Symmetry: D2
């Protein structure tokens, strides 16, 4: 049920049905903290990093073809979801990510050995440090995997969902471009605008956020691999750093480059501090959009009620028409999460010392969580709420025409004094503007209808 594996500290029992080795087993004794583990995106990015390193080491004559090919095959099995239970280590580990680096080295070595006709364990044909970790340090591998996971997640998950939600809201803005509604400023009734114009503000917000996120991508694409222990690249081939970045770009189809300054790359998490700045911007914009949606949908009788949203959860037959804005609640909650995650990242990023930042597992745990939250939240809000936003046209018109805000349309036809007198009488006596104007005898019903045109007050 167990096998005996060894490292420089001695022998330790490892579960026979697992592919990790002595160092991963020791880490399970020493970092038993909470429940957060490396996310799949990061495990995959680590496997890609090892796949690329093995290819380059083979190209340079440093690693045999049979070993490099077997390591790549084992890495491909990880990427294909065959080894999810082989990565048991906590986020809350050595701050360089050494323990997860060695977790990947051991799993890939033991599995590659089997692919070459050997066994897992100390009789293995492929070796975690001498083969799988060749030319590498934990110090440069972990930040490489951080940036690979971050850039691919932004490109493949977050940006597509942002574009999809933007397109939905742009369609709604055009569909509702002629629906005049009351403005609200300071929460008070205000000058009118169209529902389409209000939604166009949400659209422009998401378009601006996309640009800010795109501006953060070039720095995240810079990779530390090749800096080795402290940034000098001591005892590596002069072409290794460029070659491994090129190979990662090939296999991922993304524009990875080697970091021009390896000391900045090892000593900081600056690219991720900056990129997460754009994500907390998106979180503040999504919070505002989600709040507008839920407030505009509030009711069905004692709130605003200008729009309806899809009803996705069962309700009580004695409470028909009550629709809780549950997608808005999930989205506003995760937006608060992103703001907190930004603080954790900022503290970690501010806390490097000398040649190495050792707050890395926590930084990437927060960053990749924010990406999942924002991408999946935008997907869910789009599919289950935004695509179904519809106006309540009678309620919109009732609020608009019963308000006091259209009174300025009378200024050019009668006095400002008379228009103001009409509004004051309406407010004091609970009348519409039309009823107050007729009672004062300042105009005809025909004149009011001709002169007070909300569709001429939105430009």
């Amino acid at each position: 049920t167990v096998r005996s594996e060894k490292d420089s500290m001695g022998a330790i029992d490892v579960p026979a049905d697992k592919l990790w080795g002595a160092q991963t087993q020791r880490s399970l004794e020493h970092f038993r903290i909470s429940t957060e583990k490396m996310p799949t995106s990061l495990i995959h990015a680590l496997a890609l990093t090892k796949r690329a390193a093995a290819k380059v080491n083979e190209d340079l004559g440093l690693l045999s073809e049979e070993k490099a090919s077997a390591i790549r095959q084992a890495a491909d099995e990880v990427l294909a979801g065959q080894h999810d239970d082989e990565f048991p280590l906590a986020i809350w580990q050595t701050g360089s990510g050494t323990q997860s680096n060695m977790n990947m080295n051991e799993v890939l070595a033991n599995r590659a050995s089997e692919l070459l006709g050997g066994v897992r364990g100390m009789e293995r044909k492929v070796h975690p440090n001498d083969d799988v970790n060749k030319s590498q340090s934990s110090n440069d591998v972990f930040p490489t995997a951080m940036h690979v996971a971050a850039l691919l997640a932004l490109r493949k998950q977050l940006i597509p969902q942002l574009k999809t939600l933007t397109q939905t809201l742009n369609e709604k803005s055009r569909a509702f471009a002629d629906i005049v509604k009351i403005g609200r400023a300071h929460l008070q009734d205000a000058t009118p605008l169209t529902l389409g114009q209000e939604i166009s503000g949400w659209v422009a917000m998401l378009e601006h956020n996309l640009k800010h996120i795109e501006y953060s991508l070039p720095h995240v694409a810079e990779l530390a691999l090749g800096g080795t222990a402290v940034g000098t690249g001591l005892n590596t081939h002069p072409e290794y750093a460029r070659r491994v970045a090129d190979e990662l770009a090939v296999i991922t189809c993304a524009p990875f480059v080697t970091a021009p300054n390896k000391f900045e790359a090892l000593a900081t998490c600056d690219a991720l501090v900056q990129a997460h700045g754009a994500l907390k911007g998106l979180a503040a914009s999504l919070m505002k959009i989600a709040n507008d949606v839920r407030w505009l949908a509030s009711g069905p009788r004692c709130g605003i009620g200008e729009i309806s949203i899809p009803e996705n959860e069962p309700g009580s037959s004695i409470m028909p028409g009550k629709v809780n804005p549950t997608q808005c609640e999930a989205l506003t909650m995760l937006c608060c999460q992103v703001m907190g995650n930004d603080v954790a990242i900022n503290m970690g990023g501010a806390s490097g010392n000398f040649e190495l930042n050792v707050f890395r597992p926590m930084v990437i745990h927060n960053f990749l969580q924010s990406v999942r939250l924002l991408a999946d939240g935008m997907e869910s809000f789009n599919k289950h709420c935004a695509v179904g936003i519809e106006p309540n046209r009678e309620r919109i018109n009732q609020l608009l025409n019963e308000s006091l805000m259209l009174v300025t349309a009378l200024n050019t036809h009668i006095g400002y004094d008379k228009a103001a007198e009409i509004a004051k009488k309406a407010h004091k006596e609970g009348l519409t503007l039309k009823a107050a104007a007729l009672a004062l005898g300042y105009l005809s019903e025909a004149e009011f209808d001709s002169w007070v045109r909300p569709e001429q007050m939105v430009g």
Copy 2:
């Protein structure tokens, strides 16, 4: 004034303005830390003056300082406390992280002024000396944290807690006045089963009562003073009774329960008491944010919002816009609540960043802490007098919303059964009717029965 006076320290001579009372170390700090515009607040300047006044009294008691000098230093400190020397403290928050430079600012100003009070002059011929006399038995390392806690505890006791109690009393009065006014509930922003306006306000009251207890729990730790720890916490170069005596003297002159810190290493190496006390303040900020938001949403209108309450109108409006009242006190309060949340993060980072024997993030920590206390105290004072005391219900609007809602339908269940009550509610929702109109249209009851049976005052417990 253009004319200068030459002042000296261990580094040499430097020119200071002839009409000012500070000395060489203040002038160097003024010239070397030209960073932004934030300076020590008056509360902290006063706390430093109190600390020097107490230290002079105890040094005299112990035979270490002459009566002549001790009395003159106390007189100079009382002038600072009386507001006569605000322009003598020009230094930035963004200075040395121990607050050494502001300690020396007080030492120099008090020495030069005490010299004049003894018939002498300011400058290098002074009769009283900043380090040998005004800083006797002290270090910057233990003086600045002492002044931090003196300023913090007095601000909490004399400004924040009284204003919190006052706002709580006002809202308790409103809760009692409106105890019989039934209104629609709102959960998830959706219409919900009713409660009274008094019950809703009682929630705000209970929040403020809980916050007071949390703030009170933080006061004993802030009352612990570092003075007597000297440079690294061991008390080297102090009389064995000095730490206790100076805490006692500060307690006498401030009428606050200051005590010497039982562990001077914790007192010098951390800002932990302020990290914890500010945790209670960010709790109060979250509660005030919610209360302020309820007030402004409930007052929203005049015709396209909720409009269940009115608030006092303090700012001019437009003649052509009767009935519009911007909730400006609510806006100031929600803004400062956000400020307190950010200040908490700055404090937490400074508090987490001590090294070995000394935390050197102190000016920044106290700048944020005292700002949060001013904002919460003055914000509650302003919100109370300019909004809370004048909150009133709009009774007709409250009843209109309640009677137009679908949420009173369960009052029918005991009379006609669940199935028919649900049928009425569904018809009312689908057809845009009141519950009464839907019930009459189906023939399930009369108007008199509806009015007899549907009683909101029986639906609030």
Copy 3:
């Protein structure tokens, strides 16, 4: 492989081998956001809440004995770890926690039905809403479970580990009470103190933190259950709120009480905002302690090196004596996490509206994570680092006696001018204080040894 369950929205297929029902299945369609789920502590607290509600409903004659007993048995199975895979829902759900409330209602009803000789599904003998949710709302159940989980986690995990770490450091402080070392202020050499005194500062910090955490417990012990939908308790028995709090106190052995104001209890997360304030205080104290440990252990040759710590991970045979402070790295990282979690909690807690705060899943996700991180982090730091702290006595003495800081011991024997002259000569020429004093002929070697006593300079 599936069964058909029903709610008010219609029929939906549910996996036959699962115990949840229609509403939980719908939630899996609508809240597919990230990977964070309710933690075990919260699932258990929900089960305890349902167990207590069923007991009280039976006492009041509202629920049959056979149904109440079967519900309690099913809840006990959850608490015993038999149903961990029956709670699949995301944190990022309806902000009142309705979906997780219904998850518990459905699992307990389907399982209780089996315990009464029935089946799971629509033929069940026990009903999720009419039986398991009797006398309750999601609005008051979820905050009750939040406070039950929070108070029990603070009492059973965090406070014991805090006391254990404090005891270890108190023992180290006493053991090292006579070891004089150089002080450090502003990172510069400073007046001496003992290693025991320095550690006593850490101890006093942890003692103060325990008091602050204890002060937060009475508010967390207040429970919302009995306030029902909006706080009025409409259509509940007048004794129900007190009875359910009493029953929770009995079964958990903790001092739960009914909240004296149910409107504060439903409309806010104030108790948890305040309690988390004390946890971020602990995080700032632990950050400082962990940093002192790793800096004091830094080296082995080019840092401070005044203490040694246990070596828990393998190293390279060509780098003997290098010991990375990996427990300090895990602890400082999780302390940053707690600071970020506090911001997320503060935003959620500030964001209630009217009768209900609907940021609750996110608030409790953060709060319970901080408790796990701090409790497990203190356990790990204690077991794997603090218990093994030892002084490097020769290095401590070398730094102390080669510094310039002991010079003030000469002030009372010779001039201050002469002592200052000795220190300046030592600094300019790279000498010890003793060598400089002898070169100036200001004292004998015997006088220096008699007069310069570090053990007399620490009080």
Copy 4:
């Protein structure tokens, strides 16, 4: 001055100090928002004056305002910009959340002063009118966000970016000067394989270069101006060319690339551009924190720390304490970096909290944003001139640490093999020896061979 002047608004009459230029709405705000001590910063006051100067010019171009009045308003605004009226702006940050009251403060001061410039008087007989003339074509809702972006973009362009470039140049000079000085590496705080001091400093340089690019990426969005959106974004009651014309005029007079916001609803309902730009500033704060910490740790000593570099000594020391230099510039800089992190949270909360057509957290957002810019700009300026320009290596100490370390042992591998090199390192560690002493004791090489083979200058790439 005790004597008053009666000023009027729509609400009635109120007394203002006779020697002041503001009017009734400023006086009401001053009296109703007595909250703490933070006021509008001078940069924002100047941006509001620039906005009114540009609006007057365009209104005159469009035939909407007489040449007489437009020229007088521009003259009054230029007086504000020249620093002649700082005491005419007394209002708190903690005011109405749209900044209406500070908009009116500028309208009233400029109208009363422009009246005097036309031969008239201040007060109700004035020749120029705050709302009809100075606020013509404008709303508070679009003026205050415009002034926010004008102040923010000019502060970034004229203060922050130049100081960032200057500090970067200094550190690049140091990196080149020290390119040949090999020192011990430190990873996890543990001794590590070597690098040059120039290489280590090149990391700081590269950080500051990256930060400059990130800040530059944020400038186009801040350059978008809300002016012309009026009350809710539709531009009702403006000439169709007004929004473009006023952005063009602001671009001319400031020499900065201001443009009208393509979507006025986004411009009025959010502070998104400032949320994003402040994200780049908190990035810079994290980088500066790391650089400042490296400097102070590397300079720590004089005898019980690292001590690889020296820094300028700017503050007096104790005669009895030669060689001790507190890193006070590093302490001021690390403190303000914490402040920027907290300010970011306050900004994020305000930015997330817009409702419908208007974000009303604006005074708080701009107070934090402009503070962060002052702190980072002035902090970099101060750190550069008072610390960075004078950083020097301690060459003997650098070499002592390098030669006493165990981390040069791999230079032996090619000569004697891994096994013997590892044996030497283990013996040196266990017995407290240098690598050379351990190698000689085992008889594995001579002293001349060790000196020939162990070359740190060959171990840095």
